[PDB]
Design a protein around this ligand. Sequence first.
Ligand SMILES: O=c1cc(O)n([C@@H]2O[C@H](COP(=O)(O)O)[C@@H](O)[C@H]2O)c(=O)[nH]1
Ligand SMILES: O=c1cc(O)n([C@@H]2O[C@H](COP(=O)(O)O)[C@@H](O)[C@H]2O)c(=O)[nH]1
Lengths: 218, 220
Amino acid sequence: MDVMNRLILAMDLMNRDDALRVTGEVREYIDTVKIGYPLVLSEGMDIIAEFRKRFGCRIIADFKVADIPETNEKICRATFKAGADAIIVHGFPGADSVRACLNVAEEMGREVFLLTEMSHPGAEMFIQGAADEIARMGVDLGVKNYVGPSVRPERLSRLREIIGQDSFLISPGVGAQGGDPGETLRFADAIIVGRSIFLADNPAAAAAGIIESIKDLL
Amino acid sequence: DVMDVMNRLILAMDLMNRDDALRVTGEVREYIDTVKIGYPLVLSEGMDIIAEFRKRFGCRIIADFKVADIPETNEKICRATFKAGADAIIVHGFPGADSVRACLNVAEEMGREVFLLTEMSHPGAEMFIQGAADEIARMGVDLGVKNYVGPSVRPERLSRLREIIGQDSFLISPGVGAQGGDPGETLRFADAIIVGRSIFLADNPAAAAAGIIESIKDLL
Ligand SMILES: O=c1cc(O)n([C@@H]2O[C@H](COP(=O)(O)O)[C@@H](O)[C@H]2O)c(=O)[nH]1
Ligand SMILES: O=c1cc(O)n([C@@H]2O[C@H](COP(=O)(O)O)[C@@H](O)[C@H]2O)c(=O)[nH]1
């Protein structure tokens, strides 16, 4: 997966007008947008097709799928029908739930990203202790795409070690949550950035600035 | 101090087609006044489906969104969900206390309820969730969570969850019917059972619901 400027926009604005305007403002800097439930639940799944029509970007549906296998399959079907190129799945609910997602993705020509460890403080309670094993489970299942936390580079590095250099790894928590763009790209293929761009006075200037700071990694 | 679930039976409406979802829910409305709507239906038909159910049936709506993000995003998801008219939302506990608190804070501000999912009913739950479930439940109690979800298919685990949360907490339980859980046995511990496929895929969903209710008649 070739992500322009190694930068994925997390578009979590909840207003269609603002989301389209801001994305348009930064479109020259990205070709990959992560769309999550804040936008989808506020404006509908039709927003995905609208982004493809306007921007011709790839779309990662950040739905943190975390149900039983039966329901996971339905969620993935509905999501790929709406035009998502990929979907993010939690690993914590175990292997059968992940495999359900992998099956639908294969059927529809899409990718699954496995969320290992998360970036927020609460991740330390239960997720962090399971994260290495979740990553190994991903390897066992043939998962090739992973998500891990920018805010804990030692954990992100360990995740990279587990999955190998051939796997694709993207990482949120850059900017607002304190992660550093350059340090994160030591280990991740691409960084995910939301508020640092979309809440900025000048979103285009914010995006440009982040890219300038990693210019030599591109 | 808890929602009054008619017949102790909650419909899991996981049909993905608006016409079928509406038809089946209409057919069982005399037996059930509380409906669980999840992402299969919402991602297929939009959040306005919640409005449509309220308009047609006047049923309570539990949004089964298994919220499992960072606190910032959890807040936004809860806000959007309550704005659409959901009475309650289901939240995962495994992402930890700050993520749960974020949902509780929005629910408090907006006058709605959070249900905390503590262990799940599928085989995969044994890998990571089961080992964390007792602590997730205890965390819920510490945070002031009053409503919980736990699995019908592991009666020993459901019983332990009930112990942890106490008799005053509200507990609902899926996995009844299609996944093998027994209505009566489950209601030893849960306030209400959640049933999906064994009602909505039945030739006669009303008869399926009526039959389940007949089987637990002495527990109502
Ligand atoms: O561990 C994780 C996994 C995520 O998907 N995310 C997501 O990545 C984005 C981060 O946005 P921001 O740059 O504003 O902090 C949000 O959409 C959030 O839901 C995260 O922050 N941490
Ligand atoms: O542990 C759990 C938690 C759930 O929410 N569920 C949900 O409960 C419902 C079960 O439906 P069914 O009766 O068709 O098996 C589904 O909506 C599923 O997503 C579950 O099955 N197990």
